[PDB]
Amino acid sequence: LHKEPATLIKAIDGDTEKLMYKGQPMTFRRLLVDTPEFNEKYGPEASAFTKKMVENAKKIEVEFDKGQRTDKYGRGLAYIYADGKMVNEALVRQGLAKVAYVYKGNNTHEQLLRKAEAQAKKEKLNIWS
Numbered sequence: 001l002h003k004e005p006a007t008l009i010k011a012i013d014g015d016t017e018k019l020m021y022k023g024q025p026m027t028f029r030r031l032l033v034d035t036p037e038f039n040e041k042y043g044p045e046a047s048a049f050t051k052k053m054v055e056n057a058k059k060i061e062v063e064f065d066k067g068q069r070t071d072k073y074g075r076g077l078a079y080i081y082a083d084g085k086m087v088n089e090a091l092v093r094q095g096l097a098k099v100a101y102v103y104k105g106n107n108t109h110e111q112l113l114r115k116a117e118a119q120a121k122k123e124k125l126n127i128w129s
């Protein structure tokens with residue numbers, strides 16, 4: 001897999017951001033994760049976490065997997081990195097997302113995320129508390 005440049009246009013929520021990719025605005029949906037919706041428990045905290053992470057980053061990168069690059073809603077499907085740290089992984093490690101939506105051919109980082117989830121669960125973090 002390869003990291004490619006993008007620039008933040010707007011944080012949206014725990015699962016998505018508006019990013020400029022190849023000079024075109026796009027909603028990106030994070031691969032392999034599910035954050036609570038804003039009206040659910042830890043939903044606001046997941047959105048706040050991603051917002052800070054991406055807004056504070058000097059460099060945003062997107063990493064597509066081997067399979068579908070866009071979903072049925074026209075959202076890009078990627079691993080998102082903020083100054084080299086994967087936001088997808090960071091969310092799961094803090095118990096602000098579950099590993100979810102694991103489809104064959106778009107699951108390169110599945111085991112990394114599951115390890116992170118196991119640690120959040122062991123620590124009884126946020127969703128796991």
Ligand SMILES: Cc1cn([C@H]2C[C@H](OP(=O)(O)O)[C@@H](COP(=O)(O)O)O2)c(=O)[nH]c1=O
Pocket residue numbers: 015029030031032033034071072077101103106
């Ligand atoms: C994360 C992800 C979601 N999606 C689709 C499946 C779900 O369809 P449905 O909308 O029919 O439930 C939806 C979940 O996204 P959200 O969790 O952002 O709603 O997005 C994919 O198709 N591929 C993916 O990798």
Ligand SMILES: [Ca+2]
Pocket residue numbers: 015034035036037
């Ligand atoms: Ca969601």
